[PDB]
């Protein structure tokens, strides 16, 4: 009925601005001197050259990299094609590059960039030989798929009705030519339907994937020449992805069944199962050279599986260090893969007949990756990664998410490397809510099951606690909810808390920004039966006045336009009411979430600084 701090939802309230000013001041006094000391170490790690997108062309590989304040798109062995710095002297204003694609011949390249934090992006299609900009399209278009003279592309409608007259958010597919533009796909798609197109390997079939929400889809295939003959060949109810049309059959990676991932093929109405469900999730597959190449997610890290087209396992490939493995691009003869891990920013791999390492960036030092399990309330085994340095000062930085079908697999945290070097241990927990063990591993953290995610996390913290570790719990967004909720319930299992860009108010999350999008995950606060399980764990509603709490850092951004800062502000106040040792950090830099590489870098440093100071 009534929320005492509902006024905090107006971020322009001077009471709110005053809170930000005072608290930033507080937090800066607490870790500033330490943060300034650590920053060159974090930046040294953050500023590392890091690959982004890669493409196969007949003239060679084209890939983008991030370095320092710069983003370049370049010939793999050769020249820089696009710089971010050259562009920022074309406008005199700061520019972010978003992504690119090329034609298969490597004569045309299209990329996208937003000048300033301006909402509208821009797309430039340049000739790869002169560097000429043969077209500039504003606003930015996506899915640029070259065919002959023109190309298909998808436009996303955020603010405005689609041409056929449908309210946002919606998406439409087009075809551009010397002649002009025309919508070729999407008419009547109500808001929520999102689409994409990819070519088959031979390039003579279009493959179109419809998605409603983040949950469900249908597949359309047809001649790449004519959209009028793009007929629907598969209809699903749970996340599917179309792999390729090889020799008349559409190969599909589907989580239908138990929800672990299987490969099916469809030819002229008839469905046959190529690769059945395994014990562990099948997260992706690509077809290369009469061989199926598959990413199997064994306990939240990747191993590589090679199958014949008829579904017969030829071999598997394992890695020295547990890492994440994703395809970057593929043609008929080969695939590029991106690998990453805790102390390995990236490896670029090429699979053709064998797996070949063609580029690598790793951080030297005596670092170790181990694994172990915790036992949750109901006996569920909660896997977690362990990263250790040369020495062990018995302090843990424990990262969790647990939701939205998002698997926490090995990745690179720049600010953790100085923490390892200082004798710290990084822990990454695989809680329910994610996709580590399939579609039901996800469902087991949704709605009325959310307390499982918390129970999984406590299981890990309490286990680390029993072993003599000082513990810092950390999470962002849905992870920020994770840490706030675990805080209100078991403050005894952690020596400090780091709560980032969090959802806190579980009864009003749907009224703020785009929060209603999370209703399938969390529940509906407008339904009294959902409020009953929501009210049981809602951090904003469960701050225990008689419990004694650890140092707690809530952090967010003022112009963050996805996760409303008022969640942070409200929880801060609730902790402050009962005199908890809480701090509040509010980034002042607007525009996109990462203002610049340096502002972000400095924020990560403050996190490390808070951990080091409070775990000492
Ligand atoms: Cl963060
Ligand atoms: Cl989310
Ligand atoms: Cl940020």
UniProtKB/TrEMBL annotation:
EC number: 3.4.21.26
GO cellular-component term (any): cytosol
Any one Gene Ontology BP term: proteolysis
Enzyme class: hydrolase
Reactions accelerated catalytically: Hydrolysis of Pro-|-Xaa >> Ala-|-Xaa in oligopeptides
Domain Peptidase S9 prolyl oligopeptidase catalytic: residue ranges: 415-615
Boundaries of every Peptidase S9A N-terminal domain copy: 2-351
A single MF term (Gene Ontology): serine-type endopeptidase activity
InterPro entries: AB_hydrolase_fold, Pept_S9A_N, Peptidase_S9_cat, Peptidase_S9A, Prolyl_oligopep/macrocyclase
Keywords assigned by UniProt, alphabetized: Hydrolase, Protease, Serine protease
Protein name from the UniProt record: prolyl oligopeptidase
């Amino acid at each position: 009925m009534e929320d005492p701090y509902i006024w905090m939802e107006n971020l322009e309230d001077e009471r709110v601005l005053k809170i930000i000013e005072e608290e930033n001041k507080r937090f800066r006094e607490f870790i500033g001197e330490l943060s300034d000391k650590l920053f060159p170490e974090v930046w040294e790690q953050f500023s590392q050259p890091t690959i982004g997108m890669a493409r196969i062309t007949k003239k060679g590989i084209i890939a983008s990299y991030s370095e320092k304040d710069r983003v370049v798109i370049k010939w793999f062995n050769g020249d820089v094609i696009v710089d971010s710095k050259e562009l920022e002297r074309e406008v005199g204003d700061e520019v972010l590059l978003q992504g690119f694609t090329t034609d298969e011949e490597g004569e045309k390249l299209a990329y996208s960039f937003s000048i300033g934090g301006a909402d509208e992006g821009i797309t430039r299609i340049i000739d790869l030989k002169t560097g000429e900009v043969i077209e500039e399209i504003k606003p930015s278009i996506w899915n640029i798929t070259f065919l002959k003279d023109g190309y298909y592309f998808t436009r996303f409608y955020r603010k405005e009705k689609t041409p056929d007259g449908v309210n946002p958010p919606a998406a439409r597919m087009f075809w551009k030519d010397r002649e002009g533009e025309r919508m070729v796909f999407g008419e009547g798609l109500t808001s929520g339907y999102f689409m994409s197109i990819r070519k088959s390997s031979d390039g003579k079939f279009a493959i179109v994937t419809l998605t409603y929400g983040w949950n469900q889809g249908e597949v359309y295939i047809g001649p790449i020449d004519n959209p009028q003959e793009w007929k629907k060949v598969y209809s699903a109810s749970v996340p599917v992805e179309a792999i390729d049309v090889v020799n008349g059959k559409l190969y599909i990676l589907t989580k239908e069944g138990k929800g672990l991932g299987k490969i099916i093929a469809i030819k002229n109405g008839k469905i046959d199962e190529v690769i059945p469900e395994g014990e562990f999730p099948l997260e992706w597959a690509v077809i290369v050279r009469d061989k199926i190449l598959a990413g199997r997610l064994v306990h939240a890290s990747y191993k590589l599986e090679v199958y014949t087209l008829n579904g017969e396992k030829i071999k598997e490939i394992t890695f020295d260090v547990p890492g994440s493995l994703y395809p970057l691009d593929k043609d008929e003869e080969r695939v590029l893969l991106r690998y990453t891990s805790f102390t390995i920013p990236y490896r670029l791999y090429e699979f053709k007949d064998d797996l070949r390492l063609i580029e690598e960036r790793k951080v030297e030092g005596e670092f170790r990756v181990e694994e172990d399990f915790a036992t949750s309330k109901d006996g569920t085994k909660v896997h977690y990664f362990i990263v250790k340095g040369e020495r062990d000062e018995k302090r843990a930085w424990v990262f969790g998410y647990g939701g939205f079908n998002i698997a926490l697999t090995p990745m690179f945290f720049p600010q953790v490397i100085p923490f390892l070097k200082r004798g710290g241990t990084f822990i990454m927990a695989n809680l329910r809510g994610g996709s580590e063990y399939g579609e039901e591993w996800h469902r087991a953290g949704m709605r009325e099951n959310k307390q499982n995610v918390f129970d999984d996390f406590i299981a890990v913290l309490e286990k680390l606690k029993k072993e003599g570790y000082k513990v810092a719990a950390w999470g962002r967004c849905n992870g920020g909810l994770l840490v706030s909720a675990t805080l209100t319930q078991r403050p005894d299992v952690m020596d400090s808390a780091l709560i980032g860009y969090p959802v806190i108010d579980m009864l009003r999350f749907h009224k703020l920004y785009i929060g209603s999008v999370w209703i399938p995950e969390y529940g509906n606060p407008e339904d009294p039966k959902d409020r009953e399980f929501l009210l049981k764990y809602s951090p904003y509603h469960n701050v225990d006045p008689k419990k004694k709490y650890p140092p707690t850092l809530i952090y967010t951004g003022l112009h963050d336009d996805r996760v409303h800062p008022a969640h942070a502000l409200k929880f801060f106040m609730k902790l402050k009411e009962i005199g908890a040792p809480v701090y509040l950090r509010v980034e002042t830099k607007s525009g996109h979430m990462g203002a610049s590489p340096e502002t972000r870098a400095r924020e990560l440093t403050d996190l490390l600084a808070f951990v080091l100071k409070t775990l000492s």
